[PDB]
Design a protein around this ligand. Sequence first.
Ligand SMILES: COCC(=O)Nc1ccc(O)cc1
Ligand SMILES: [Cl-]
Ligand SMILES: [Cl-]
Ligand SMILES: [Cl-]
Length: 163
Amino acid sequence: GAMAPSYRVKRMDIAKNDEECVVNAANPRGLPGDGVCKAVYKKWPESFKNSATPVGTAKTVMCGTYPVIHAVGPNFSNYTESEGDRELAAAYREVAKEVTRLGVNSVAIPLLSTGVYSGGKDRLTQSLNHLFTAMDSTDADVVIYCRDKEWEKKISEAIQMRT
Ligand SMILES: COCC(=O)Nc1ccc(O)cc1
Ligand SMILES: [Cl-]
Ligand SMILES: [Cl-]
Ligand SMILES: [Cl-]
């Protein structure tokens, strides 16, 4: 575990992370995809061998010794708000199981279902609160990656508001 487990947020490409493992915002079919998934595919393409996994689950594939945790958030275009909310919470619980199993002291994590799986809605708070619900019982340092300047501010505020 980390001596004093923390949450941080950085606004940059998660492919450039400084953590012991990464969470991919994956699709269920293990395809290169778009956004974070495409960045992950470019950086760690070896980790897409048999990475397909259902919605609401996480599947870890090693790129060398570097773990890539493929977490499949729901596409809110396809799910009802109720069912999508349940699957989004479930994907994060599976990330927390994998982070724990791996014994890492840090993890880089994007906000699941906030980009092209958002169904055109702002899901920062929904996705971040499911992240916290799952990750709060873990002792890894968590570094959340985002690209938008206003999202960085809002994630940073949410982290600071609970310290
Ligand atoms: C069951 O754990 C498998 C594993 O490889 N874990 C791991 C631990 C630390 C690290 O920095 C990278 C990976
Ligand atoms: Cl960058
Ligand atoms: Cl997304
Ligand atoms: Cl963002």
